[PDB]
Write a protein that binds this DNA or RNA. Structure first.
Ligand SMILES: [Mg+2]
Ligand SMILES: [Mg+2]
Ligand SMILES: [Mg+2]
Ligand SMILES: [Mg+2]
Ligand SMILES: [Mg+2]
Ligand SMILES: [Mg+2]
Ligand SMILES: [Mg+2]
Ligand SMILES: [Mg+2]
Ligand SMILES: [Mg+2]
Ligand SMILES: [Mg+2]
Ligand SMILES: [Mg+2]
Ligand SMILES: [Mg+2]
Ligand SMILES: [Mg+2]
Ligand SMILES: [Mg+2]
Ligand SMILES: [Mg+2]
Ligand SMILES: [Mg+2]
Ligand SMILES: [Mg+2]
Ligand SMILES: [Mg+2]
Ligand SMILES: [Mg+2]
Ligand SMILES: [Mg+2]
Ligand SMILES: [Mg+2]
Ligand SMILES: [Mg+2]
Ligand SMILES: [Mg+2]
Ligand SMILES: [Mg+2]
Ligand SMILES: [Mg+2]
Ligand SMILES: [Mg+2]
Ligand SMILES: [Mg+2]
Ligand SMILES: [Mg+2]
Ligand SMILES: [Mg+2]
Ligand SMILES: [Mg+2]
Ligand SMILES: [Mg+2]
Ligand SMILES: [Mg+2]
Ligand SMILES: [Mg+2]
Ligand SMILES: [Mg+2]
Ligand SMILES: [Mg+2]
Ligand SMILES: [Mg+2]
Ligand SMILES: [Mg+2]
Ligand SMILES: [Mg+2]
Ligand SMILES: [Mg+2]
Ligand SMILES: [Mg+2]
Ligand SMILES: [Mg+2]
Ligand SMILES: [Mg+2]
Ligand SMILES: [Mg+2]
Ligand SMILES: [Zn+2]
Lengths: 151, 138, 237, 208
RNA sequence: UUUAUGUUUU
RNA sequence: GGAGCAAACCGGAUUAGAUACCCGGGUAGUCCACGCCCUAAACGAUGCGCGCUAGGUCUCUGGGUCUCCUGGGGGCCGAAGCUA
RNA sequence: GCCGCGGUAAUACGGAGGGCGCGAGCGUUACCCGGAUUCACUGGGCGUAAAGGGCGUGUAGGCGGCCUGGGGCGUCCCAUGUGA
């Protein structure tokens, strides 16, 4: 049911007398392409193990992706740390235009047609966290009005 | 002092909604009310009422928020997430009718002052006019 | 029957902390005199009312409340009032993770059962003079923090905190998990993150024994047969 | 111009039989029957998790190889499809299908896309009555494709027209087998055409 | 209160 | 104008050398008037004016119907928010 | 081309076999735009990263509180001419 694509595996290292002790970390995406996505960052002493908690943590953080016909409802821009992502909806029949990080997320979530650009810091970890927040903050014509009426 | 009376307002609102305050006093002007109107008519505020502080005219603005949420940060959503000045005193911004903004794909309002009065992205496109572009809200 | 008057709320249930406040506590505060902010007890009603509405509804669907206070004031009025309900509670220190990690901290409960059997049994005396005292000492403190947490091997839909500030940990612990949070909160803390609010003195045992006491009663009534007054006054004043 | 030399290295390489062949890629060899791995010294070695670009490359090459078309032209058509109003994935696929040499294959006057190429450039084909030798030629709705007059002999034709009976041609196409001819009825809608391709990627390729 | 320094690329 | 101090300079030490560090001397200068010079870690490394966004505490200094409140300064800790 | 390869096992040099990409072309060099929100109007900044003027007073210039009329310069609308 859920799909796992993963944008980041990397080896960090710390230092102790006599050598550099390593460790690994993994950015993993999780989704059904029905509009359900999640992202988590796992870190453990080996790649597969860390890919594991990647998935684990991934499902512990998720979001509604209020598609309209494969695009999003409206243009959104969000910044996490120094990194910034611009999300604009494109009419169906376009494509999904983004870099590796904002694509994998956006594409597992549905979204066959969208336009984007990464601005500021292109760091993939911090760009991912900013892409979720810019999905998470999306709102449709409905929750718009359920917001402002009175009552 | 206040070089921009209008921008000052939208900022007093922005700053209250951030702290979740019932209302805020925003010293009064005709043209500030006409704008403060469109904010209730379109539902970003419960509404205002003319009042008095030290015999000095003010407009109390009553603030709308969303429902208490859950998870940590148990704090309401925003009825006004975003309010900011387009054309300001430093650079004035005028748009013809074909040139009027799209704000949030239509999910939101763009307040713009025209010869027919203070209108909104739609209202002006409907009258077919355009004019100075006050600000944008969602 | 259930309720409380504003008369017995006068033992001293209005205010503790003076100037020590947390100004988000405005709505529930009346006036300042002689140091302490005196906490409005008419709102304490409208709230104690709406609060209990969630407790009563919860108890009669068979859900659980988890009891927390670590203070000197709120300790012995937890153990008693909690067992008398049949609910779980934390008496001594609140172990970090006890909610977000139920899984690993509860593996420490199993060891409590594993220690209870083996007290005297068809095993023990065969383990040398060292090991016995060792294991039983591991039981002693084990029973100390985990006595009241031993019950309810699944995690609750509520907790009841004496001072929402004295364990901030807990309130957020549960809040991260969607677990609703209800507590007795004076000027010490902010209404904010507490989901069902009991705005009264969280010190001065007279207040914590009174508000928790008749709050344990409300739980038996949705179970059945509210009973005669349980231990409250012991060393009291 | 068009690619020449070994075909089965492509049947393979890509890793899916694309039938660049005659009856053979149907036999128990597309060569992909015996050896379902990429050509050369390294084919049997354990593969690497492919680059995101590597996947879009292979996909594009698959589709492009199927029609036996030079990249010069293959991209002409992709830019056309983009400038045209439409879903831009399928307008590309329609435009490709609408080639004389592709139709003359789909309608089976010849067995392979390549046999259907030399067939046109040799004068053995006709469109709307006219001699047309250019494989790149378009056909829109309503056109009549037919074998030529002098060309109805040559066992090659009627050896391949015979074998047509019993096979149902494409919804967008029609063929009268006794009179050796067909009509291009309409644009071959996405679903109407299942290739092995995911055409999405072929687009995500050219956006650099 | 005596000390200064440690060839090049890995 | 010149008491003390002290670049330069001389001497005693130190050191492999010691144009330095330590010690004994010591002249511009340090001070005053007038006139120049116009630099600086001239630093909060934070331009100026205005409005708006919790509080806690220490302090200087006015006014108060002087257990508190109010105004202008100087410090710490901090809400929201900002920040790599 | 940038990070960098070659110090007697070099997927980095040279040949080979094999493979990838284009194909009457394929490469190289030079130059323009692009990616560069890296001159930022759209769309950046200035405590410690490059960036607050040493501090004042003030000329021009820029900006400018509340109420009501007059003009209609900006602005906005329509029509029309021109926009080869
Ligand atoms: Mg930034
Ligand atoms: Mg950058
Ligand atoms: Mg980079
Ligand atoms: Mg198009
Ligand atoms: Mg392009
Ligand atoms: Mg030397
Ligand atoms: Mg060295
Ligand atoms: Mg000397
Ligand atoms: Mg000497
Ligand atoms: Mg010597
Ligand atoms: Mg030395
Ligand atoms: Mg000396
Ligand atoms: Mg001297
Ligand atoms: Mg001199
Ligand atoms: Mg400077
Ligand atoms: Mg300042
Ligand atoms: Mg200045
Ligand atoms: Mg003073
Ligand atoms: Mg006084
Ligand atoms: Mg002050
Ligand atoms: Mg501070
Ligand atoms: Mg904070
Ligand atoms: Mg050798
Ligand atoms: Mg070798
Ligand atoms: Mg070697
Ligand atoms: Mg190379
Ligand atoms: Mg070589
Ligand atoms: Mg070869
Ligand atoms: Mg070769
Ligand atoms: Mg060329
Ligand atoms: Mg700018
Ligand atoms: Mg910059
Ligand atoms: Mg500045
Ligand atoms: Mg600097
Ligand atoms: Mg300065
Ligand atoms: Mg200045
Ligand atoms: Mg200067
Ligand atoms: Mg000035
Ligand atoms: Mg002036
Ligand atoms: Mg004015
Ligand atoms: Mg002026
Ligand atoms: Mg006027
Ligand atoms: Mg015209
Ligand atoms: Zn084959």
């Amino acid at each position: 049911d859920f799909e796992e694509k993963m944008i980041l595996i990397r080896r960090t290292a710390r230092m102790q007398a006599g050598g550099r002790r390593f460790r690994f970390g993994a950015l993993v995406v999780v989704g059904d392409r029905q509009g359900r996505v999640g992202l988590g960052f796992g870190k453990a002493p080996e790649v597969p193990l860390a890919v594991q908690k990647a998935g684990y943590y991934a499902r512990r953080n998720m979001v509604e992706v209020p598609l309209q016909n494969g695009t999003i409802p409206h243009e959104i821009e969000v910044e996490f740390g120094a990194s910034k992502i611009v999300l604009k909806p494109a009419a169906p029949g376009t494509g999904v235009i983004a870099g590796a990080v904002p694509r994998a997320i956006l594409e597992l979530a549905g979204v066959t047609d969208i336009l984007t650009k990464e601005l500021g810091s292109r760091n993939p970890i911090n760009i991912a966290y900013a892409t979720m927040e810019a999905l998470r903050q999306l709102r449709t014509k409905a929750d718009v009005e359920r917001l402002r009426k009175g009552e | 002092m206040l070089t921009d009376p209008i921008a000052d307002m939208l900022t007093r609102i922005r700053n209250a909604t951030r702290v979740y305050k019932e209302s805020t006093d925003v010293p009064a002007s005709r043209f500030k009310e006409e704008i403060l109107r469109i904010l209730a008519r379109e539902g970003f505020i419960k509404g205002y009422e003319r009042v008095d502080v030290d015999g000095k005219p003010y407009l109390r603005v009553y603030l709308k928020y969303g429902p208490r949420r859950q998870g940590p940060d148990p704090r309401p959503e925003q009825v006004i997430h975003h309010i900011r000045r387009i054309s300001k005193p430093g650079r004035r911004v005028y748009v013809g009718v074909k040139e009027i903004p799209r704000v949030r794909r239509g999910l939101g309002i763009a307040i713009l002052s025209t010869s027919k009065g203070v209108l909104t992205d739609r209202e002006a496109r409907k009258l077919g006019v355009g004019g100075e572009l006050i600000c944008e809200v969602w | 029957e259930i309720t409380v008057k504003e008369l017995l709320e006068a033992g001293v249930h209005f205010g503790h902390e003076r100037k020590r406040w947390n100004p988000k506590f405005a709505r529930y505060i009346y006036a300042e005199r002689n140091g302490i902010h005196i906490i409005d007890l008419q709102k304490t009603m409208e709230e104690l009312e709406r609060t209990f509405r969630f407790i009563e509804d919860l108890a009669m669907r068979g859900g659980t409340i988890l009891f927390v206070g670590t203070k000197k004031q709120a300790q012995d009025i937890v153990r008693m009032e909690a067992e008398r309900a049949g609910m779980p509670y934390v008496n001594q220190r609140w172990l970090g993770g006890m909610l977000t990690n139920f899984k690993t901290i509860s593996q420490r409960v199993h060891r409590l059962e594993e220690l209870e059997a083996l007290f005297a049994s068809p095993e023990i005396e065969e383990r040398p003079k060292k090991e016995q005292v060792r294991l039983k000492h591991e039981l002693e403190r084990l029973q100390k923090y985990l006595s009241g947490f031993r019950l309810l091997k699944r995690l609750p839909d509520a907790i009841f905190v004496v001072d929402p500030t004295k364990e901030a940990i807990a309130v957020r612990e549960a809040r991260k998990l969607f677990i609703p949070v209800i507590a007795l909160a004076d000027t010490d803390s902010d209404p904010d993150l507490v989901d069902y609010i009991i705005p009264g003195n969280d010190d001065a045992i007279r207040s914590i024994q009174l508000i928790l006491s008749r709050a344990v009663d409300l739980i038996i009534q949705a179970r059945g047969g509210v009973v005669e007054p349980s231990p409250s006054y012991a060393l009291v004043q | 111009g068009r690619y020449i030399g070994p075909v089965c290295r492509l049947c393979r390489r890509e890793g899916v039989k694309l039938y660049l062949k005659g009856e053979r890629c149907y036999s128990p060899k597309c060569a992909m029957e015996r050896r379902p791995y990429p050509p050369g010294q390294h084919g049997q070695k354990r593969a690497r998790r492919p680059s995101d670009y590597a996947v879009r490359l292979r996909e594009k090459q698959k589709l492009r190889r199927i029609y036996g078309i030079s990249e010069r032209q293959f991209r002409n058509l992709f830019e056309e499809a983009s400038k045209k109003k439409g879903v831009t994935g399928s307008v590309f696929l329609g435009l490709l299908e609408s080639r004389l040499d592709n139709v003359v294959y789909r309608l089976g006057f010849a067995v392979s896309r390549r046999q259907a190429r030399q067939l046109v450039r040799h004068g053995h084909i006709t469109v709307n009555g006219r001699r047309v030798d250019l494989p790149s030629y378009r056909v829109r709705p309503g056109d009549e494709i037919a074998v030529a007059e002098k060309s109805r002999n040559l066992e090659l034709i009627r050896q391949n027209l015979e074998a047509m009976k019993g096979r149902k041609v494409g919804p967008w196409l029609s063929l009268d087998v006794e009179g050796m001819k067909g009509k291009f009825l309409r644009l071959p809608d996405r679903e109407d055409l299942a290739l092995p391709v995911n055409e999405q990627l072929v687009i995500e390729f050219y956006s650099r």
